[PDB]
Amino acid sequence: KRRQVYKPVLDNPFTNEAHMWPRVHDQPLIWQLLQSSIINKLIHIQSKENYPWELYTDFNEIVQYLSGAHGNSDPVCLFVCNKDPDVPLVLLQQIPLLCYMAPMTVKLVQLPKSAMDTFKSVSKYGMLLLRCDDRVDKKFVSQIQKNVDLLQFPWLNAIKYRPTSVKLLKTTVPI
Amino acid sequence: NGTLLVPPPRTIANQDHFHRLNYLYQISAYQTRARQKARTDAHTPLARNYIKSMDLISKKTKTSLLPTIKRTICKKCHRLLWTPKKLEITSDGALSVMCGCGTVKRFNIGADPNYRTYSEREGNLLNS
Amino acid sequence: DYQRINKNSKIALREYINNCKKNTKKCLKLAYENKITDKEDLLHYIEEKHPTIYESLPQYVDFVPMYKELWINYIKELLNITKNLKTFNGSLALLKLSMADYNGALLRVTKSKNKTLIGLQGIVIWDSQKFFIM
RNA sequence: CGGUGGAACACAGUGGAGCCUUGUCCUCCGGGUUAAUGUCGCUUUUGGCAUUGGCCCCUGCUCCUGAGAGAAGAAAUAUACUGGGGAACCAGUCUUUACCGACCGUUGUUAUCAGAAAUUCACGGAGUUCGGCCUAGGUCGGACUCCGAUGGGAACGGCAACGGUUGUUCCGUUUGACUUGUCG
Ligand SMILES: [Zn+2]
């Protein structure tokens, strides 16, 4: 006979607050320009995808770019899709973490729509890192990023004790 | 299949042990972050010690942790991986995370998506 | 070099607590060479004239808020010390203190067999078996 | 707590009986040199492989026993490995003029969940090599290597029992002095 027992397991008490993805609103005004630009890149030539706009869409290149090899470009922007199925969670629990230790001004934007499976199924993996140094795109990227799309850290900024979190999991026991 | 019994009388000794484990994890993480934000690796063999003692308490009470904690800490030297060495992907395998000591913690990520751990599934977990 | 130190965390902790004592002795020698009794001028003197010696020096001014607030708040949560004090239970509280760890505690030597050990306050960085480190 | 005064230097202290695998002058594995043979490439000849024969490879010290303490420069900084001790160091596995190394085998266990899997069952992916169909190199089978989110774990790792050592097992004393009794 099977009996269900609830076992107490210690939780990471700040992983919910460390994965508080930033507040994004009025987002369908942004995907139009972003998707139009990405498609206009992806149409002509795979070298002409990366000649006018320098973007990296492979996570090894994201780590090697944020390691400290290129330090000239200080405003660098990132776009990562959450709330989307068929997306790996091991990378997703480490993308907002690795950008925090980067000395460059890296601006993560979390895309909140669940139906946006296009950018993952089309380009590479569903993430986009590019540079706003002298491009035209920054002329609107600096417009909206102060409005709603602010990214700041409250969790490491001040000194605060954190309450413990002990959850409990299900376990079957056959006798 | 069986009997459905859901007890919310948490036991006092288990709460004491998990508060001890969580306090050791918090003080080790805050030592590591307060040292890492300011300057170079000053007392990085110190905070690791706490984690090691933490894992030894996990030997005594025979309790289990979420895979977030064991994914954060190491396996051999038992150090925090908040500042790892290198992260590589699609290098003819799945994934690799290198450390300073040389012990790596890799994950089979190139097989298929939508794979969750047993504590991260929809209904298997009840908070507090 | 760095890999051979942290092969065992205990031996690296021993090397760290030896290096802190050696750096403190070198700090006393450079402080007598400085001939300035003020410690706030002494730290800036070491920052100006001895960069590699300053790297392993402890920071007690940093050490107090990073430890005391977390320790006091953990004891206020664990021993159920709230605004209502008239529902306290001492025996279970002493049992919890027997079950709680002392790593990170402020503790004071009030009585000792040695007359020189008394009067020392300090915060735990590591608990040993039969000695104590503050 | 252990051993000696019973064993005479292993003469297993000696004798007898029973059984069998009938007590094999045997074999450590392993590594080096030399000689002979056969194959494959360079062509006085040399190199690689396999077999056979010969040699070489370590009683750390005292003591009958029990036990005691010395040092780990033939690869390290902490002086072989592992854990702790505040440090001389302690415990366990080991070796010691080792100018080569050597953690013996079998059985069971590591409950429940988790995970593909709790013992080199199996399964999934990648790379290499070989064979068949076949020839823009597609597929199939066999072998090796690496990895797979979990759990203290995947490490022939930890725990417990049993010796092949010079065949096993059983039985008996080599331990006495006076007093008394019997027998020659
Ligand atoms: Zn590590």
A94 and A164: one domain?
Answer: no
Q: How far is the CA of A118 from the centre of ligand 1 (A)?
A: 37
Report CA torsion sign: A172, A174, B4, B9: negative
- Displacement of CA C60 from its chain's centroid (Å): 8
Residue carrying structure tokens 């020096």: C57
- Displacement of CA A47 from its chain's centroid (Å): 26
For residues C23 and C59, is the Cβ–Cβ distance under 8 A? no
Contacts of C70 in chain A (CB under 8 A): 161
Q: Do A163 and C69 touch (CB under 8 A)?
A: no
A11 and A91: one domain?
Answer: no
A58 and A108: one domain?
Answer: yes
For residues C100 and C78, is the Cβ–Cβ distance under 8 A? yes
3-state helix, strand, coil in chain B (%, to 5): 40, 10, 50
Which range of residues forms the domain containing residue A53?
A: 22-159
A3 and A60: one domain?
Answer: no
Q: How far apart are CA A147 and CA A154, in angstroms?
A: 18
Contacts of A161 in chain C (CB under 8 A): 69-70, 73-74
A11 and A34: one domain?
Answer: no
Q: How far apart are CA A91 and CA A80, in angstroms?
A: 11
Task: Give the amino acid at C126.
Answer: W
Please tell me whether residue A39 adopts helix, strand or coil conformation: helix
A137 and A69: one domain?
Answer: yes
Chains that touch A (3 or more CB pairs under 8 A): B, C
A96 and A174: one domain?
Answer: no
Chains that touch B (3 or more CB pairs under 8 A): A, C
Task: Give the amino acid at B29.
Answer: A
For residues B46 and C13, is the Cβ–Cβ distance under 8 A? yes
Please tell me whether residue A77 adopts helix, strand or coil conformation: strand
Option in B15, B66, B82 nearest A11 (CB): B66
Number of domains in chain A: 2
Burial (0-12, 13-18, 19+ Cβ within 10 Å), A104: middle
Please tell me whether residue C46 adopts helix, strand or coil conformation: helix
Report CA torsion sign: B30, B37, B46, C6: positive
Q: How far is the CA of C1 from the centre of ligand 1 (A)?
A: 16
Among the listed residues A91, C122, A51, the one whose alpha carbon sits nearest the alpha carbon of residue B89: A91
Which nucleotide is nearest to B55 if distance is taken from CA to C1'?
D152
A173 and A147: one domain?
Answer: no
Q: How far apart are CA C125 and CA C134, in angstroms?
A: 7
A46 and A70: one domain?
Answer: yes
Q: How far apart are CA A163 and CA A23, in angstroms?
A: 24
A102 and A124: one domain?
Answer: yes
Long-range contacts of A117-120 (CB under 8 A, 24+ apart): A117/A84, A117/A85, A117/A86, A118/A35, A119/A35, A119/A38, A119/A81, A120/A81, A120/A84, A120/A86, A120/A87
Note residues around ion ligand 1 (Cβ under 5 angstroms): B 74, 99, 101, 103
Q: Containing H/E element for A18?
A: helix A15-18
A8 and A85: one domain?
Answer: no
Among the listed residues B93, B49, B109, the one whose alpha carbon sits nearest the alpha carbon of residue C12: B49
Question: How would you classify residue C35: left for phi > 0, otherwise alpha for psi between -120 and 50, otherwise beta?
Answer: left
Distant-in-sequence, close-in-space partners of B12: CB < 8 Å, separation ≥ 6: C92
A48 and A113: one domain?
Answer: yes
Q: Do C69 and A164 touch (CB under 8 A)?
A: no
This structure's resolution (Å) is 3.5
Which nucleotide is nearest to B109 if distance is taken from CA to C1'?
D149
Tokens of C131: 């000695």
